[PDB]
Design a protein around this ligand. Structure first.
Ligand SMILES: *[C@@H]1O[C@H](CO)[C@@H](O[C@@H]2O[C@H](CO)[C@@H](O[C@H]3O[C@H](CO[C@H]4O[C@H](CO)[C@@H](O)[C@H](O[C@H]5O[C@H](CO)[C@@H](O)[C@H](O)[C@@H]5O)[C@@H]4O)[C@@H](O)[C@H](O[C@H]4O[C@H](CO)[C@@H](O)[C@H](O)[C@@H]4O)[C@@H]3O)[C@H](O)[C@H]2NC(C)=O)[C@H](O)[C@H]1NC(C)=O
Ligand SMILES: *[C@@H]1O[C@H](CO)[C@@H](O[C@@H]2O[C@H](CO)[C@@H](O[C@H]3O[C@H](CO[C@H]4O[C@H](CO)[C@@H](O)[C@H](O[C@H]5O[C@H](CO)[C@@H](O)[C@H](O)[C@@H]5O)[C@@H]4O)[C@@H](O)[C@H](O[C@H]4O[C@H](CO)[C@@H](O)[C@H](O)[C@@H]4O)[C@@H]3O)[C@H](O)[C@H]2NC(C)=O)[C@H](O)[C@H]1NC(C)=O
Ligand SMILES: *[C@@H]1O[C@H](CO)[C@@H](O[C@@H]2O[C@H](CO)[C@@H](O[C@H]3O[C@H](CO[C@H]4O[C@H](CO)[C@@H](O)[C@H](O[C@H]5O[C@H](CO)[C@@H](O)[C@H](O)[C@@H]5O)[C@@H]4O)[C@@H](O)[C@H](O[C@H]4O[C@H](CO)[C@@H](O)[C@H](O)[C@@H]4O)[C@@H]3O)[C@H](O)[C@H]2NC(C)=O)[C@H](O)[C@H]1NC(C)=O
Ligand SMILES: *[C@@H]1O[C@H](CO)[C@@H](O)[C@H](O)[C@H]1NC(C)=O
Ligand SMILES: *[C@@H]1O[C@H](CO)[C@@H](O)[C@H](O)[C@H]1NC(C)=O
Ligand SMILES: *[C@@H]1O[C@H](CO)[C@@H](O)[C@H](O)[C@H]1NC(C)=O
Lengths: 584, 584, 584
């Protein structure tokens, strides 16, 4: 509650200062050279190469029964899948639509045969299965299996043979040196093995005697009974069945890269030694290197070039036909995480394999961060430039207002109470030491000069009585609790005089140069020159490691688990038998 | 180092200007109409429907031995799994807990039988396996397998039959038209096939003679020897075993959608034709359309409605019991990426299938971007409003300070040195052309008027001597290196005169109207009116395509790989035999 | 188009106000105590434990042929895999590199034997398969299979036996109580079962008579014919083959945690009860708890401690050898989502199992949000501090300029036209009520005082004629369309008088105290004191649920699908046979 006053001795030319000329503000050259265009992004092809084939085999069952007193007993049953030799196929099924009843094959290196029901061989028609729905079709000749019992006390052996033609779906994966079938049989030969076009250099685990090729082969549709259209056709006689598939060259069917996404409007900027591809429709930003990608380092990449050319030409002709024009041939870049962006640059009218990560967020995060960063940097640059203009403008008010009141402005700028004079075009400042304790300042009642009536004081008079015995100073009350050491502020005595003066924590009121009243500072109504800026801060957040499906849930979508079946079924003999007891 | 001076000819009323009235600032109406409430998010169910069943079968082994000189030789061994007909089950096992020793079945379309050890049929008790741990239990009758040798030189055939009852776990996937068992057998009949409640319209690949239903069937627990509780029970006699499972209706057990996450506090805002669901506890924002979702377009969605009703009612009663109140029935929205949000709106007291993506991460990105965007937009709006108030306030200082010094303020505003006059309520400006070269300005030593002593000049006097022969102008030094063409700035000769004047790069010092000294501008102490704003920019970042597990690592978690086993084991005959040699 | 004037009655001391002292601005203490260091992040090990083993078995085929008239007929063929007893192995193959031609085994609890071709037993050399490429090698003795036909009308039975030694790859998963082989056989014994070191306490589903251990066993390489180096070796005789594998202790080979990523420069800050690990090279932020993690709660975690010690010591010695120094032993924290960060703190020179999520995004998002939040909060703090200094500085201009023009500044601050007086050190304001309608203000032509020539008016004179009959006021035009009710603003008649005054929407021009002309306000040239701030807002974005591979694509990378093979092949008997017809 104690007011602090100062005592400012008269200044001296010692400390002179000046206002700095207006500072220049940096011009922020934020903005890069970009390039609009069209892009097609390609990922690695992880799917298996899928085609359709046919299996031709005969089901040769050999049943041995023991005819008993009142029953028949099967004492053996040997089921076996045997191939159909290509001679019978190309000479009987695709000729008359019939299949011989006699199996001729090779087992244990011997040429063995077998006859259904031990009868004369016939040619039976191939009849569709009862479940021949779409896709999975099969034609067989016999619905019955033959066995005989005999007279009680003897063994009799029967035998069935069932000509079966099934359409299967084959499937081969890189490096395409084998393919498995829906029946479960692995065929250790590439689907592109042949005799011409350098195909004889494919992989094959079989001898060339098992392999037959029919150029111009006209396969037969067993439903419409009509020959199909000519097409080279491979036939391979596996020890347990015969596979046949339409031959197709390797160069035109499989390709390591597949189109992932077409992007109509991209923008390529160049940031510090690296390219950047911003795609605002996907909200995805890929970051490549400045070098081109040579598609000769990747196996089987012949599709992408022409595929992307057709797609990119269509996109340009359908969207940018009139606004822009092309500027050269397509460029190929390897984006980060294993992607391949085929980029066509537009202008306005003015060996290994690639492994792709399984994400797109490392890119969506990149786009979002780039957006916020670019925008916030632009806004900060604008704030900075605007701030400079405002300071350079306020320098004029400060420089133009010093003549009117130099001491107040110099005390504000230096954040310390000082007394300043204008010595022409410069300012001579001087520190005002604060009035210490042991000092009693008494306030006089009247502002009138003694005896004189046309002249009166301007500010209230005070008496700074000293306590250390240094006498008694008699001055008057300056401004902002500044105590001048003289009474040289007089004025012509105005009429209807009313003034308020700041005395510590009070506003003393003087009417006709005499004390009238006093009012606390906290009682006077307030006027604010302050403009408000209530800026709130971003709060801290914590992200939870959320998931839509767990690994268990993702390994729970199939009908059977191979490892489960094997763990449960491979202890059939341990569970239900005693493998440790010996019989003597 | 050369100072540049100007020469300002007297202005003319030609160019008059004025201060613009205060500009209005836009009121930013940033803020949307939101709606708090509770939500439950549902994903597609990708798991298989799992139940428990029992398999009843007999292991019929037929061994053929050749008794030799000093050894016995197995010349054949035919193992086979055969069904247990439902008559024996429902009449002997669930009646006395015993199983007949005689197998009666159908092979090759003939009714065949077989007897263990070729003896009289018995009824053996079903005994638990030695490995009957939790879950996987099995009861069998015989631990031994019977075979006989005979006299050296003859073949003898034995036969075992082992009654086996196993509890398996069945598993069926959409569209639920088959189910596989832990033993490996596919049962081509839906788990919900029956005779009542329209169940006879399910899928079945078998004839109705193989199917038996026992309404009110009381199954028997082979451990506590006690009947279980009544429940309709289906029995199906597959050619190789008999499956039995408790029947359950399709409408009450399987449902395409499963609850993923309950969210207690959500907020639905409406942004440009689309809904948005902000969930601050998950930090996830889903973006749907304005339309409701009809759950009748999705197969098997009967669970979600009532399930969500119970959960949502519990959540309200446990958290928002007193603060808010409900405002109508639940609404169903299809969020983006394939999710289903069942949203219950609160208020304060004042056919196909759905395919779900495997990542809500695009939604965590959405939430984070929405947060930064909303907050930064709010802060920019506040900066803009505050900026307007500050400019509208500084307009008062500029307008109020022009009378004191019009030329300085007009030179600052126009960013060009000009001379302005106040022609009443307007300002008449005039350009000040800069003083060119070939001009020598000489500085006079004394500021005193010749002869006069009570009158002296205010600013130093200069002599602008010309070189093109245009004579010699004699004026004095104005302010800011302005060269007035006259000497009309006089003053009453003050006592103790001290002034500093700016002469190019120097402050010339004059004491009693005579030159005294000079000081370089770079030597005078400085006072700064500048407030600092050191704003730093966001730097560029590069995100690496990081992963926790690769695709290989994710295909390395199982005990066996089916394709690996098949590639290695299906060349057993090629590796270890010579399939190309013929014997003659 | 109508100008609005005011009428301000003379103020009264009633409403006095004052400028607020400068407001203090909060010092933003944004900044946390961080700790630099090195970290190694460890994920859960999901891969199977993979080792190499050898299988020793004999292929015993038993063929029964029926020699016919002009052909041979196989009436049975029983293939079987039989073990090689360990006596023959350790006494003949690893001694001489030969294998006996006689199989001795146990089937149906009887000790059975069999001889290839029914000949005298021999010792045949083990010969490599023709396909012995890298890795998968196999040595067998016979490429041929023996069978005989006989005289037409009789059955003859042959038999092959083929000694086969294959190198397989075994594979066991947690809790390591079984392992499967590449041949498909499950071995129900832990790979770490033994006789010493407490290994006899592992899991084993077999009797101890089937198990043999050879301490110091020197296995034999069948290619270089040389003994290998000594190593304890387990042998187990499974009912269908014999497995042999080098024994290795459980404590030194398998460990639940695997090193995921080494991070050279991390920074651990402490935010609200939780630790945070910022890794700027990965752009990843993990958020743990303040507690240490006890690695004794996790099974098989013995690797991580010493592994991380070696790696962390190497990292320090290679990068931070001279800049920093260590500050204690390593600390172990469980980050969120199931990760384990082993953190070594640096200083400058001044039981269950852990389940890991499959993401590295919930943390890349965390890092990015932390970066934007920290930077934007720092910038907002700087804007706020700068704003305070600027307001505290502008308070000096407002306080210092009130003496010059109190009414204009008080009208601007209060955003309302008022009339203010300076009553010493305070300001007494008074509201100026606006001049209503029914009032005609007439403008006089001359500014000259009647008769007097050395004295003239300063502002144009007006006559406010009243219409309600209240007479006619005669005053003059004040400033800013303020209508003073008196004519007390006179001036010494200057020469060359030129003034512009604002009359509504016009600037009336007066030359020598007489009306001259008028100009519309919209016609006067403009000067702007306004500094521009064009701040643009962030626009709304929508993220699409993008994916690189779908779930189908990820389940399409294998050669065969087990469930597909089983669904297609398990209806072989239903498709191609008639299981519903009975023969009588
Ligand atoms: C061994 O026995 C089986 C039967 O156990 C024999 O199968 C028969 O042969 C038919 C020809 O292959 C086969 O397909 C037939 O039916 C197909 C389905 O069409 C429906 O409408 C039929 C009435 O016209 C109806 O009988 C039939 O119902 C049977 O099939 C359904 C299918 O799920 C079962 O649910 C039933 O239980 C029942 O078994 C169907 O509802 C039909 O598409 C077939 O037509 C073929 O040919 C057409 C040319 O005209 C062509 O246009 C069409 O696309 C098809 O390719 C065909 O009519 C049946 O399964 C069965 N036939 C009968 C009398 O039901 C099998 O042939 C035999 N094998 C040998 C070698 O002997
Ligand atoms: C063919 O031969 C096999 C043996 O080769 C027969 O199996 C026997 O029959 C028992 C009943 O099915 C079967 O289970 C028994 O043991 C179970 C384990 O309990 C433990 O504690 C026992 C102490 O009393 C101990 O002997 C036993 O150790 C045996 O089993 C473990 C299993 O890992 C082996 O590791 C050992 O080598 C040893 O063989 C166990 O440690 C036990 O749970 C069973 O109790 C059942 O019934 C209880 C009712 O009272 C019930 O409460 C409980 O829940 C169980 O359901 C039971 O005691 C054994 O494998 C074996 N018995 C013996 C004497 O070892 C098989 O029956 C036979 N098949 C036929 C048809 O002939
Ligand atoms: C049952 O019959 C099969 C044949 O049907 C017998 O297999 C023979 O035995 C050889 C030894 O195991 C086996 O491997 C031999 O060839 C390997 C490949 O090397 C190549 O270069 C050879 C030039 O000399 C060339 O002949 C050979 O071409 C054959 O094999 C390739 C393999 O794909 C086929 O594509 C061809 O069609 C052709 O069949 C190869 O191109 C070779 O690595 C082997 O050397 C081993 O031993 C070396 C020690 O000196 C060692 O350095 C090396 O690392 C190998 O371990 C070996 O020469 C062949 O498959 C075959 N031999 C012949 C004559 O082709 C099998 O032995 C028999 N089983 C029994 C028990 O009777
Ligand atoms: C700023 O705004 C927030 C939001 O309502 C408010 O809580 C806070 O009190 C405000 N601060 C000031 C100083 O007005
Ligand atoms: C702004 O702050 C940064 C951070 O320390 C500093 O490097 C830079 O020099 C500062 N700029 C100015 C102009 O002070
Ligand atoms: C602000 O800048 C944007 C960007 O070009 C522009 O469209 C807009 O008109 C500007 N606003 C103002 C008021 O100048």
């Amino acid at each position: 509650t104690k007011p602090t006053f100062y005592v400012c001795p008269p200044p001296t030319g010692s400390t002179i200062v000046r206002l700095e000329p207006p500072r220049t503000c940096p011009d922020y050259h934020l903005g890069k050279n970009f390039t609009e265009g069209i892009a097609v992004v390609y990922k690695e092809n992880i799917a298996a190469y899928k085609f359709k084939a046919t299996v031709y085999y005969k089901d040769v069952i050999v049943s041995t029964a023991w005819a008993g007193s009142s029953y028949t007993q099967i004492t053996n049953r040997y089921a076996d899948r045997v191939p159909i030799p290509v001679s019978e196929i190309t000479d009987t099924i695709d000729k008359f639509g019939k299949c011989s009843s006699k199996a001729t094959y090779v087992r244990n290196n011997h040429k063995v045969e077998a006859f259904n029901e031990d009868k004369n061989p016939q040619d039976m028609p191939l009849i569709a299965s009862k479940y021949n729905s779409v896709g999975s079709k099969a034609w067989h000749t016999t619905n019955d299996t033959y066995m005989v019992a005999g007279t009680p006390g003897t063994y009799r052996t029967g035998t069935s043979v069932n000509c079966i033609i099934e359409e299967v779906e084959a499937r081969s994966i890189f490096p395409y040196d084998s393919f498995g079938l829906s029946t479960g049989d692995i065929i250790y030969m590439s689907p592109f093995f042949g005799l011409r076009d350098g195909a004889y250099r494919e992989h094959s685990n079989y001898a060339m005697d098992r392999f037959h090729q029919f150029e111009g082969y006209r396969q037969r549709d067993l439903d419409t009974r009509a020959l199909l259209e000519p097409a080279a056709r491979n036939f391979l006689v596996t020890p347990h069945l015969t596979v046949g598939w339409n031959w197709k060259p390797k160069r035109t069917e499989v390709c390591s890269l597949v189109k992932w996404r077409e992007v109509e409007d991209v923008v390529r900027d160049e940031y510090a030694h690296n390219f950047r591809f911003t795609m605002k429709t996907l909200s995805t930003t890929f970051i490549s290197e400045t070098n081109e990608f040579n598609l000769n380092q990747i196996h089987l990449s012949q599709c992408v070039k022409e595929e992307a050319r057709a797609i990119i030409n269509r996109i340009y002709t359908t969207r940018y036909n009139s606004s822009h024009v092309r500027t050269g041939d397509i460029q190929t870049y390897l984006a980060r995480g294993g992607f391949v962006v085929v980029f066509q640059p537009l202008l306005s009218n003015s060996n290994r394999t690639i492994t792709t990560t399984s994400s797109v967020e490392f890119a969506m995060l990149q786009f979002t961060y780039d957006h916020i960063q670019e925008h916030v940097n632009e806004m900060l640059a604008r704030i900075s430039s605007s701030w400079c203009q405002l300071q350079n403008r306020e320098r004029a008010l400060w420089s133009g207002l010093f003549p009117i009141n130099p001491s107040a402005l110099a005390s504000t700028i230096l954040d310390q109470r000082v007394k300043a004079r204008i010595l022409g075009d410069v300012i001579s400042v001087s520190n005002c030491p604060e009035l210490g304790s042991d000092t009693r300042i008494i306030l006089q009642n009247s502002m009138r000069v003694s005896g004189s009536t046309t002249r009166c004081y301007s500010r209230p008079l005070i008496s700074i009585v000293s306590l250390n015995g240094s006498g008694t100073v008699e001055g008057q009350l300056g401004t902002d609790n500044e105590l001048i050491m003289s009474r040289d502020l007089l004025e012509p005595c105005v009429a209807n005089h009313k003034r308020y003066f700041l005395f510590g924590h009070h506003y003393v009121y003087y009417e006709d140069y005499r004390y009238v009243r006093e009012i606390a500072v906290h009682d006077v109504g307030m006027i604010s020159t302050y403009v408000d800026l209530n800026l709130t801060l971003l709060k801290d957040r914590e992200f939870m490691p959320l998931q839509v499906y767990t690994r268990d849930e993702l390994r729970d979508t199939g009908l059977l688990d191979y490892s489960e079946i094997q763990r449960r079924n491979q202890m059939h003999s341990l569970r239900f038998y005693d493998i440790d007891k010996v019989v003597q």
